């Protein structure tokens, strides 16, 4: 489209390493109870360490399963939310984890990869960093791939309504993306599952489409979740999206009625972003 | 909740008929290519005709299958969009059909039932009209039942964000509902799949929750559709919902990229409501 899109990447690893030119690369895997998938994800990236990748961490976000110990056994440095930034009490949600991870990394470039991926290609990271290394003015790279109910029913239609320029983004909510530290530390971080959409919209509003690229990763598999759980995610995405569009959110959580006779449950929603990590230094 | 909710209805048909007190009841089944389900729906209601129900029509919305002939063979009066209101050229979408149906009916009370239902209970209509007949000040009755991806991910979360008072509505997009002619002819009709949500929000804004009821119909089955198709529906629901909340919609249709290599397709969206049918008389 009007967006820089690689529908098939082809840089070799040696070219990319050469292109670093003193710049460093950190990789962060946020993880909450992903014991089943975490090892395969770590193993897919660790051969790059001390070479193309200078740093790899798992940001453990309060797991109560064997996530941390399995990650350690895969040679990964595991960092709790508390260790990333101990002077600041921990809030729940993904955005907190990603924001904190900036304080636990040092790379000029930062790559995020979700830890719930089922057997990810070992070229995910090179493909994401390609445009940052060989491009001009690129500061953010989003992935896409080949059922994404929230993406196609919520985020993309809302983008069409309120930021149609971002209509060309195939996977705005993708947990796999890369960006410059300079950008990331200059942006606020939305709470919960709002974090990705916020970064995308803020980036666009600030630098326009020319600073954004997207790359095809092929076909990704993962643990599809419960509708009930995607309600809360959609709610936070909506809250975050409306905010960027200058629209006031009620702050009222989604309520759900579960049949058993029905019982009612209300999920939390947050209207508070974390500020740019820059202000913390 | 704060809403009048019958979690199990129990009026007998003779009580309801008595309660009519000179008021009449029309039933409308909108239909676009529903040949597989239309007969069962018609048959479920026709025993009520000349009794509780004074009038039953199928509003054929441009079907190219055997919908019309099968409906006729079930003893139903079939009315095209053109026959309902021939002086006015036809627009596409559900809202046009429902709006036009007001000109093809005469009942003081109007009941809508979707024609894509799989073997609906013959008590749907009595259950919906109950609160209008035996209640006070009720002008609109919505159904609910026991996976509704658009309802739980789009409409209910957006309602929480922008009209949290309607959070108690379990099925805001339900195609099965009943209302007074006086109300319906005083409201505009949103285009496409926006029609239900528009009527609900307009009703609430104008008369408040006390004029709205919802009733449990048990468990409904129907033809679940393609994500791609629910994209356009969500888009129109969003457009219609934002409008009622005073928020400008871009008017840009949802675009989708279909793998084959990808191909791109853009779906139509409409920001034009039909005005109250009253102005047409
Ligand atoms: O509270 C949370 C919830 C989500 N996740 C991460 O976000 C993804 C969704 C999962 O793979 C987790 O790794 C997280 O780090 N903290
Ligand atoms: O253009 C349309 C599309 C939808 N429908 C009706 O709305 C429901 C969805 C279907 O059951 C159809 O009967 C209609 O009347 N016209």
UniProtKB/Swiss-Prot annotation, chains A, B:
<feature type="binding site">
    <location>
        <position position="94"/>
    </location>
    <ligand>
        <name>UDP-alpha-D-glucose</name>
    </ligand>
</feature>
<feature type="binding site">
    <location>
        <position position="222"/>
    </location>
    <ligand>
        <name>Mn(2+)</name>
    </ligand>
</feature>
<feature type="binding site">
    <location>
        <begin position="114"/>
        <end position="115"/>
    </location>
    <ligand>
        <name>UDP-alpha-D-glucose</name>
    </ligand>
</feature>
<feature type="binding site">
    <location>
        <begin position="148"/>
        <end position="151"/>
    </location>
    <ligand>
        <name>(2R)-2-O-(alpha-D-glucopyranosyl)-3-phospho-glycerate</name>
    </ligand>
</feature>
<keyword id="KW-0808">Transferase</keyword>
<dbReference type="GO" id="GO:0016758">
    <property type="term" value="F:hexosyltransferase activity"/>
</dbReference>
<keyword id="KW-0328">Glycosyltransferase</keyword>
<feature type="binding site">
    <location>
        <position position="220"/>
    </location>
    <ligand>
        <name>(2R)-2-O-(alpha-D-glucopyranosyl)-3-phospho-glycerate</name>
    </ligand>
</feature>
<keyword id="KW-0479">Metal-binding</keyword>
<feature type="binding site">
    <location>
        <begin position="220"/>
        <end position="225"/>
    </location>
    <ligand>
        <name>UDP-alpha-D-glucose</name>
    </ligand>
</feature>
<feature type="binding site">
    <location>
        <position position="61"/>
    </location>
    <ligand>
        <name>UDP-alpha-D-glucose</name>
    </ligand>
</feature>
<protein>
    <recommendedName>
        <fullName>Glucosyl-3-phosphoglycerate synthase</fullName>
        <ecNumber>2.4.1.266</ecNumber>
    </recommendedName>
</protein>
<comment type="subunit">
    <text>Homodimer.</text>
</comment>
<dbReference type="InterPro" id="IPR001173">
    <property type="entry name" value="Glyco_trans_2-like"/>
</dbReference>
<keyword id="KW-0464">Manganese</keyword>
<comment type="similarity">
    <text>Belongs to the glycosyltransferase 2 family.</text>
</comment>
<feature type="binding site">
    <location>
        <begin position="193"/>
        <end position="196"/>
    </location>
    <ligand>
        <name>UDP-alpha-D-glucose</name>
    </ligand>
</feature>
<keyword id="KW-0460">Magnesium</keyword>
<feature type="binding site">
    <location>
        <position position="116"/>
    </location>
    <ligand>
        <name>Mn(2+)</name>
    </ligand>
</feature>
<dbReference type="GO" id="GO:0000287">
    <property type="term" value="F:magnesium ion binding"/>
</dbReference>
<dbReference type="GO" id="GO:0006011">
    <property type="term" value="P:UDP-alpha-D-glucose metabolic process"/>
</dbReference>
<dbReference type="Pfam" id="PF00535">
    <property type="entry name" value="Glycos_transf_2"/>
</dbReference>
<keyword id="KW-0106">Calcium</keyword>
<feature type="binding site">
    <location>
        <position position="224"/>
    </location>
    <ligand>
        <name>(2R)-3-phosphoglycerate</name>
    </ligand>
</feature>
<feature type="binding site">
    <location>
        <begin position="148"/>
        <end position="151"/>
    </location>
    <ligand>
        <name>(2R)-3-phosphoglycerate</name>
    </ligand>
</feature>
<comment type="function">
    <text>Involved in the biosynthesis of 6-O-methylglucose lipopolysaccarides (MGLPs). Catalyzes the transfer of the glucose moiety from UDP-alpha-D-glucose (UDP-Glc) to the position 2 of 3-phospho-D-glycerate (3-PGA) to form glucosyl-3-phosphoglycerate (GPG).</text>
</comment>
<feature type="binding site">
    <location>
        <position position="94"/>
    </location>
    <ligand>
        <name>(2R)-2-O-(alpha-D-glucopyranosyl)-3-phospho-glycerate</name>
    </ligand>
</feature>
<keyword id="KW-0170">Cobalt</keyword>
<dbReference type="InterPro" id="IPR029044">
    <property type="entry name" value="Nucleotide-diphossugar_trans"/>
</dbReference>
<keyword id="KW-0408">Iron</keyword>
<feature type="binding site">
    <location>
        <begin position="30"/>
        <end position="34"/>
    </location>
    <ligand>
        <name>UDP-alpha-D-glucose</name>
    </ligand>
</feature>
<dbReference type="InterPro" id="IPR050256">
    <property type="entry name" value="Glycosyltransferase_2"/>
</dbReference>
<dbReference type="GO" id="GO:0042803">
    <property type="term" value="F:protein homodimerization activity"/>
</dbReference>
């Amino acid at each position: 489209p009007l967006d820089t899109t690689w529908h098939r990447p082809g840089w070799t690893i040696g070219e990319l390493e050469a292109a670093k030119a003193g710049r460093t690369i950190s990789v962060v895997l946020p993880a909450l109870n992903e014991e089943a998938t975490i090892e395969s994800v770590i193993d897919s990236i660790s051969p790059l360490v001390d070479g193309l990748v200078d740093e790899l961490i798992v940001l453990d976000s309060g797991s109560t399963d064997d996530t941390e110990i399995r990650a350690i056994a895969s040679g990964a440095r595991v960092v709790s939310r508390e260790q990333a930034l101990p002077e600041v009490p921990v809030r729940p949600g993904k955005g907190e984890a990603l924001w904190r991870s900036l304080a636990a990394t040092s790379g000029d470039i930062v790559v995020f990869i979700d830890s719930d991926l089922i057997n990810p290609h070992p070229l995910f990271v090179p493909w994401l960093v390609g445009p940052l290394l060989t491009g001009e003015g690129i500061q953010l790279v989003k992935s896409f791939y080949r059922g994404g109910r929230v993406t196609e029913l919520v985020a993309r239609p809302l983008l069409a309504a309120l930021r149609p320029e971002l209509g060309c983004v195939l996977q705005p909510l993708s947990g796999e993306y890369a960006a410059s530290r300079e950008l990331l530390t200059s942006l606020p971080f939305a709470p919960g599952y709002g974090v990705e959409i916020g970064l995308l919209i803020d980036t666009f509003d600030r630098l326009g489409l020319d600073a954004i690229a997207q790359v095809n990763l092929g076909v990704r598999a993962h643990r599809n979740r419960p509708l009930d759980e995607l309600g809360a995610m959609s709610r936070q995405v909506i809250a975050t999206l409306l905010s960027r569009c200058g629209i006031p959110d009620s702050g009222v959580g989604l309520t759900q009625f579960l049949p058993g006779d029905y019982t009612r449950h209300t999920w939390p929603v947050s209207l508070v972003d974390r500020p740019p990590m820059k202000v913390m230094r």
